Amino acid sequence: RKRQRELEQQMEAVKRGELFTQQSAQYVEAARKHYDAAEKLNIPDYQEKEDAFMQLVPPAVGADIMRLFPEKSAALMYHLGANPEKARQLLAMDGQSALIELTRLSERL
Amino acid sequence: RKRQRELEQQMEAVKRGELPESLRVNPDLPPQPDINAYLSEEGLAKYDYDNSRALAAFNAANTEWLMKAQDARSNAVAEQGRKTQEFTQQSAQYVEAARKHYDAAEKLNIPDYQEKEDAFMQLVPPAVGADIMRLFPEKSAALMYHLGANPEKARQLLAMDGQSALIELTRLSERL
Amino acid sequence: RKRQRELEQQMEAVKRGELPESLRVNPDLPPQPDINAYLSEEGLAKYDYDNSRALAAFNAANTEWLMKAQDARSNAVAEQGRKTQEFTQQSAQYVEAARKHYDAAEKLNIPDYQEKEDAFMQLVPPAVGADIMRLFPEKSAALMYHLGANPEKARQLLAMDGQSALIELTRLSERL
Amino acid sequence: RKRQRELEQQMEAVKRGELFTQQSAQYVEAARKHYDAAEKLNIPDYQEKEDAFMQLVPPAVGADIMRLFPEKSAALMYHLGANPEKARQLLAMDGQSALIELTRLSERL
Amino acid sequence: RKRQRELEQQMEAVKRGELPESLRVNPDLPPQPDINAYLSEEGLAKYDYDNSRALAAFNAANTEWLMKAQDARSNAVAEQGRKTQEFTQQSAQYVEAARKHYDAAEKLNIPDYQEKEDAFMQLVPPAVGADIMRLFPEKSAALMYHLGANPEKARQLLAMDGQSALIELTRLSERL
Amino acid sequence: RKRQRELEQQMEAVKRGELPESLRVNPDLPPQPDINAYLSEEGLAKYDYDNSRALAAFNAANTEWLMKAQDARSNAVAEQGRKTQEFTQQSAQYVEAARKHYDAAEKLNIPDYQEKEDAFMQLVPPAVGADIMRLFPEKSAALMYHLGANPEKARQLLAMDGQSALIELTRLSERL
Amino acid sequence: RKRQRELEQQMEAVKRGELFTQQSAQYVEAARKHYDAAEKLNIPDYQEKEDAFMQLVPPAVGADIMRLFPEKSAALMYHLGANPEKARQLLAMDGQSALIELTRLSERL
Amino acid sequence: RKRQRELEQQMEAVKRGELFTQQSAQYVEAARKHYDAAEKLNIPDYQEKEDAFMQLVPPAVGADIMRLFPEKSAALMYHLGANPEKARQLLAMDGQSALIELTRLSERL
């Protein structure tokens, strides 16, 4: 709940005028549905995997996948952290093929 | 065919080494340490009121600037070679682009591909089309056909970024 | 044949690397910054009456002259290699020149090519003839024949520029 | 007539001593025969094509073609602006082949 | 065959780049201008009794020594490449040497070539034999045979220079 | 198989260029000549009591340190390339190591090779085993078998050096 | 006997404190058994061969073979000086294969 | 005799210390045997031919042939000046084939 609290603190500082804001607001809502989908995942070990994700990808690509797929995002990062070898190969590779594995993760559901 | 002919002519232009001046990577020489600011009487007052340490560390600064500018020019050569190699791989994937255009003319044979391709070129930037033909070579013709059948979808695609387009397209492809 | 023999002998002379001293590109070393003008008492009076900044910026000037003269000599090597490559491409297009002279002797067979070619060589500078044989290899013989049939046109061509002359060459060719 | 006026103003400033002048004078006369050849063309839509020409080629090559061919220059630029795809390909290419199309434009006349 | 095997093994040793330390061309760095001799009080007395011109021209001397030593090392690289190319052409002509030894074993078939070749190797320096096999490949076997038939002529050839010996070789060849 | 799988996986790790930081050869920059010790008043008293020769030879020392540090870094690159080439040749001889492990599994087929190989790995350092498999590839399995049949000989081999431990290996091989 | 005298002089200087000493002492004893094996060889022409050996190999490898094989060392160097072509090829080659010929020299005895 | 006098003057200046000298001395002796061979030729018209030779070849190649063939040099240059067409063709050609005609001149004698 602490990460939600700090994200909400940053966003309320943004809306208070402590200055590009519209997408951040959509990221607030997409994070709400993100943790909804995290409950939908219901494998309580995903916290270390998502910690590893934020520490290994830049915030930009994580934000992109966070906003793209509101209903499957938690499972997407959980299973790409399950196979982080492909995560680093896609750190070397262009994001199009990583996007393809994201789409196949959509394919299973 | 004429569009393919100009594409392949650009290809042999690239393969020989016709590299535009804009593509010439100019070395980013780091600034040299200043002369007056360091080795003036104020610098002497820093270093116990003597010209000695000023000349010492300025000779050292000369040397370090020499090595960092040398590394800058050697880099300039290095990413010039890297740019040459990325022209080579571009050229390769454009060879498969020309070959898949041959393949589309060989296999598709159903639609009015010429004018729909013209409309798609006129609509989207060439980079998006290049990515489409690189990742979806054989279906690119049918994809342009279905996009031409949907001009409303076409100017969504115009209004929005190339990568996204990828999927939704990829998607659209797997919807069909 | 003897003219072709001397042309091809010049060719093997070029291919081995017989490069005349006039073709040796001497490096254009930029002038070094002056010694007395910068680092004298007048320079000291510029820089708050001290030998300090004078020695500082003169060491800096030494360093920058070292790098610019180094870049000058490295360039001299670079355009020496460029000149070698342009000798190679010349040599190539002169190989097609000798081969098209073979082709003219093989195909034309109609005119008195030797003396008309001699007259054309005696009239125009060799550069114009080289450009003519490079761009219009097979028709060059008939072109010299028709020019010899028109001495008045011949000394117009003599009086006027090479690029300019060819037009004549070319629109005369498409008149025939 | 405005472009003629500004060219003549620049050239009379040059001849007044406001400083390479001999070729500029020959360019004055070659521009006179240029607009003579423009009347010889007599397709009144060439103004936008020649505007595009000056804005896409450097002044040097336009000057070269202007001085080379006094009697056909207007038609030369009109028809190379008709096909400006070859104009940009020759911006990429050496000027020798562009010169070849100039010569073929001479060939039609 | 074993002599041919060791010759060709030396060949693949050369082709990979096994270059002996004696063949490493050390750069000939020109001497730097002297420090005390130029920029002492005697030099000052030359230049109107002041340290000024001494430091000026010594910085200039530093710069010119930097460029001449740089040209020296760049040359060292240049004739190192030239030496590599002359190893390549040596290697080529030794490839024809091995191939003509094959040809001699194929064609001659008449004499006791092995021991006469051994005697010729034991007599003359290897450079003379290399030149003989380079210019007269096919007849070299019969030439060694006729020289072995003439030991008195053999030790004239030993006593006298390689170029001269050759004519001998050659006008003996055209005597036969 | 799993040991062979990890060996070959290390192989493809090496072939791509995964080079550990310990294998990064740091350049050995020679020390720069000292500043105070040379160009102080004691140095002036050496050179006839003047700052002149001190600045002269210190500029010279700057230049020579620049060239020796430059040669040091160019060397660092040179033995980095040499280290890359020795990784390539290791990789080659480890490719024959994996291939001879295939060959042993194909041909030997008699002994319990897995656990005897495990014991031999646990006993001797990996370098000795690497040399054994490099020089005696096919017999290495039977050699480990006979060593496992002789634990007393095994811990002699442990107690004593690899070149000799090997002797042991080889004259044991020719005893059998 | 002169080489024994100079080796013993160097070693007694070492033991006197004129400075890595333990292996030198073992080299004293291994040289004693070396010349024992030299008598075992009993072909009195080996002196020039061993002179050539010391002048063509570094002292390190000669010392290594001297210490490795106390009972066969004299014959080893006598027969590698008999074939010094292999000696120089092993100067070019790694010492492992030279060691293999040393082992085969052990094989004959 | 004047050319001998000037050559000897240059060589005695060289030996006096007015400075690569050993080959010049051998050239003195080879010139002595050169004019011995010139007497052996005994066709008194060779002076203009050798004047033409020195004025058409560089001194280096003339010196090389002078030193190579002490006994036949005069006839060599006399007959290559007889056919100076081959002399200029070999000015264009590499010296190896000129050397071949020198060898055939040796073949006649």
Author numbering:
A (entry chain B), D (entry chain F), G (entry chain H), H (entry chain G): 70 to 88, 156 to 245
B (entry chain A), C (entry chain C), E (entry chain D), F (entry chain E): 70 to 245
From the primary publication:
Tailed double-stranded DNA (dsDNA) bacteriophages and their eukaryotic counterparts, such as herpesviruses, possess a dodecameric portal at a unique vertex of the capsid; this portal serves as a channel for DNA packaging during viral assembly and delivery. The portal interacts with multiple copies of a scaffolding protein (SP) to form a nucleation complex, which initiates the assembly of the major capsid protein (i.e., coat protein) and other minor proteins into a procapsid. The P22 procapsid consists of an icosahedral coat comprising 415 coat protein (gene product [gp] 5) subunits, a dodecameric ring comprising portal protein (gp1) subunits located at a unique capsid vertex, and an internal core comprising approximately 250–300 SP (gp8) subunits and 3 ejection proteins. In this study, we present the structure of the SP gp8 in complex with the dodecameric portal in the P22 procapsid at subnanometer resolution.
When the density map of the portal and domes at a resolution of 15 Å was displayed at 1.9 times the standard deviation, the side view of the GOF nodules revealed that the outer dome contained three neighboring four-blade windmill-like structures. The four blades of each windmill-like structure in the outer dome were connected to the inner dome through a column, with one blade contributed by a side nodule. To confirm this notion, we performed local reconstruction of the windmill-like structure. The results indicated that each windmill-like structure comprised four gp8 subunits, constituting a gp8 tetramer. Each blade comprised a base dimer. The outermost part of each blade was not part of the gp8 tetramer but was instead contributed by the base domain of a neighboring gp8 subunit. The gp8 tetramer was stabilized through a four-helix bundle formed by the four-column domains. The tetramers interacted with other gp8 subunits in neighboring tetramers through electrostatic interactions between the base domains. Local reconstruction of the top region of the outer dome revealed that this region comprised gp8 tetramers. The SP tetramer primarily forms through interactions of the C-terminal region (residues 122–136) within the column domain; this explains why a recombinant SP fragment (residues 141–303) does not form tetramers.
